[PDB]
Design a binder for this molecule. Structure first.
Ligand SMILES: CCCCCCCCCCCCCCCC(=O)O
Ligand SMILES: CCCCCCCCCCCCCCCC(=O)O
Lengths: 49, 49
């Protein structure tokens, strides 16, 4: 058959799952340390006092 | 004349100058925190006092 001129140029692309904006949590300033450290600091604080 | 099938597909495209290092601003020392944070710190300072 004899095609006509392309009316839509395309190709092979890459599709991935759209990511999320990862809205920071309210209490995210605690993230640098683990929950165990934060809990142990309170225990250490009480003990020292 | 009679053109053959396209061997290359092109379009209109924006050309600009490649961004270069931004000259540091006068009050650049305020960049690590957003304008909102600095404003809220002032409000928190007043409130706490
Ligand atoms: C003077 C010693 C204590 C200073 C105050 C530290 C405040 C942090 C304690 C509460 C955080 C507990 C962690 C649970 C939340 C989490 O990180 O998942
Ligand atoms: C307790 C005072 C802390 C120091 C506060 C310094 C900054 C005061 C002014 C805050 C608002 C303007 C500065 C941010 C400007 C911007 O980056 O757009």
């Amino acid at each position: 058959i004899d095609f006509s001129k392309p009316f839509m140029s395309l190709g092979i692309s890459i599709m991935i799952k759209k990511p999320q904006k990862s809205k920071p949590g309210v209490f995210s300033f605690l993230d640098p340390l683990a929950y165990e450290i934060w809990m142990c600091i309170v225990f250490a604080y009480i003990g020292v006092s």
